[PDB]
Structures are given as C-alpha cells and as structure tokens.
C-alpha cells in the first residue's frame, strides 16, 4: 500500500491551489479517504472527508464553504480543491486511508487512517 | 519434532519423514505454524507477490 | 466534541510503565484511535476501537477506557518510543483529534 501526495507550493492570500494524492496497492474504490492537516508544531485537525462512490462528503467548519474534495476512481486519483485561501491555512497536508473496507453501493461511517501520506507543505 | 517446538502437530500423521513449518514473527513475538509436507526431491521454485 | 490529554509532556527513564490518559468530554461509548507520530514522519496507527492492538505493532503497547475517559500504556518504554501520541474520536463525522502529548527518556 503506498500514498503519495503532490501540488503543495506558495500562493498569495485569496489564491487557490490543486492538492493531489496518487494511491496505489490497494482497491481504491472501497475505501474512503481524508485530508488532515498539521500547522507548524501544531496537532493535527481533519479537514474534509470523501466515501467511496462520493456521493457524501464532509468538511470542518474552519474549511466550510471554501474547498472542495473530489476523487477519481477511474485513476487512483484523490483530489482537493482550495479556494480563497486565508494566512492560517498554511500547514503540512496529508491524504489518509481508511481501515473498513465498504461496498461501492453503500454508503458509510468513517474514522481509522491504517495509511498515511508523507504529506506537502502548503504556504501562503 | 525439538526444532519444530510447537505441539499443534495434527493427528494421523507418522513420526519417521519430513514436514514442513513456518515460524512467523510479529515483532518480539515467534509463533511456529504448520503448513504441511512436500516433495522429497524438488526441480524448480516459484514464489508469487500475493 | 472535545478532547483533553494528560499530561501533556512526560518523560521516563527506559523499560518503565509510562501512562498517556485522554477524556472526550461527552459519550463516546468505545470509539476511540490511538495515533503515534515520530518527529519529521507521518503517523502511525496503534490502537483502534479503543483497545483492539493493531496486526503491526509490539505487544509492547496496551489500550483501554469507555464513555468518557480512556489511556494508553507503554509497559517498558523502549528508547524506539520517542515520539507525539495523539487520541482522536470517531463517534461524529466531524472527528476531532486531541492536542497530542510527548515522550521523553533520560
Ligand atoms: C521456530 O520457533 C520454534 C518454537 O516453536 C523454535 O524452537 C525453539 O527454539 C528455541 C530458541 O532457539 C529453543 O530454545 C527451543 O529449545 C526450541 N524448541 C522448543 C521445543 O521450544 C525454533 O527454533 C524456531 N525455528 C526457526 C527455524 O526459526
Ligand atoms: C530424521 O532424519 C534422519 C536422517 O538421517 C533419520 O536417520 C532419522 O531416522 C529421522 N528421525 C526420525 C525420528 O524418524
Ligand atoms: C525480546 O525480549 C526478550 C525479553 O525482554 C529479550 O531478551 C530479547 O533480546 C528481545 N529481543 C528483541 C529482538 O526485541
């Protein structure tokens, strides 16, 4: 099983950005996938979250209304979309896996990354 | 049957020929497992990724 | 929903029986990971379902808890342990993680 994330870089306030994460080694389309962030020498807070099929996504209220998840089943491919970027954005992001395996006609609960990115550095 | 040192040997099998183990590692942790037997003599070896 | 670890730095001398607490400050019944991250790498999964070992990682560590309070043990802290653990929820989707807390030996 193997994460990679890219697209990370330096963008002025207001910017916007195209986050992505190639996976590989596993059934792509039965697991769902999170972005979660870590500020300089901060914890880590989870940022949004995608299922399977991607009928259902989520996102914290510090990230609401302003990005965008996205994934592409067809190439292994898990997308993230910023917008009107703020100052206190800028953090290290990683794209994680799920543990529970679910059908691609389900839709389902979430919650125990197994697999973790090495994670971009975003700044603004 | 010392170097295999599990007791989980399965019933019907005759002390006297060979049988094949595996010992797995799970950290500090080993555990012996058996798998079964095979030939005597062997002409070529084929491992898969899976 | 909240979370809250004590303490929020220790430190412990090698092969001792180190103990990490988390609260979550409303019922979460049992759904609770448990998360190790060494400095400059991505975490790590240690503990899921608040007590279930993960298939990857030494006996060494140990889990449990319900509803509102829960903690990891480390039963002989090795110099490998150096590193942040960090307790995160799942009982909302809105998942929350905690502020972390770190290791040290001496
Ligand atoms: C696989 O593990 C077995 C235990 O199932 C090992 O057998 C013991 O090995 C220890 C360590 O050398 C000895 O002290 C014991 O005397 C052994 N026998 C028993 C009955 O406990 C075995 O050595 C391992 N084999 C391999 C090839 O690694
Ligand atoms: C084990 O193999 C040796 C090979 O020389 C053989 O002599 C011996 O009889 C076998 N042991 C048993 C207990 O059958
Ligand atoms: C495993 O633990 C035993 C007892 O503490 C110790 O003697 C042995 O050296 C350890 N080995 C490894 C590889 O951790």
């Known amino acids: 099983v193997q994460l990679v994330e890219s697209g990370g870089g330096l963008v002025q306030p207001g910017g916007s950005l195209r986050l992505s994460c190639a996976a590989s080694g596993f059934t792509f389309s039965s697991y769902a996938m999170s972005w979660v962030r870590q500020a300089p020498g901060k914890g880590l807070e989870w940022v949004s979250a995608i299922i399977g099929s991607g009928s259902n996504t989520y996102y914290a209220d510090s990230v609401k209304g302003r990005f965008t998840i996205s994934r592409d089943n067809a190439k292994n491919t898990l997308y993230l979309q910023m917008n009107s970027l703020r100052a206190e954005d800028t953090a290290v992001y990683y794209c994680?896996?799920?543990?529970?395996?679910?059908?691609?006609?389900?839709?389902?609960?979430?919650?125990?990354?197994?697999?973790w990115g090495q994670g971009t550095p975003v700044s603004v | 049957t010392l170097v295999s040192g599990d007791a989980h040997i399965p019933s019907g099998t005759v002390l006297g020929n060979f049988y094949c183990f595996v010992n797995t590692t799970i950290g500090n942790e080993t555990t012996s497992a058996f798998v079964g037997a095979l030939p005597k003599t062997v002409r070529e070896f084929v491992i898969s990724r899976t | 929903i909240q979370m809250t670890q004590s303490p929020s730095s220790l430190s412990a001398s090698v092969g001792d029986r180190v103990t990490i607490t988390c609260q979550a400050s409303?019922?979460?019944?049992?759904?609770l990971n448990w998360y190790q991250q060494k400095p400059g790498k991505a975490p790590k999964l240690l503990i899921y379902d608040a007590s279930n070992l993960e298939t990857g990682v030494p006996s060494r560590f140990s889990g449990s808890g319900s509803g509102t309070d829960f903690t990891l043990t480390i039963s002989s802290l090795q110099p490998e342990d150096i590193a942040t653990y960090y307790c995160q929820q799942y009982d909302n989707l809105f998942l929350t993680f905690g502020g972390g807390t770190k290791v040290e030996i001496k």
């Open positions: 994680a896996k799920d543990t529970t395996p679910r059908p691609l006609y389900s839709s389902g609960w979430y919650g125990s990354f197994d697999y």
């Open positions: 409303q019922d979460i019944t049992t759904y």
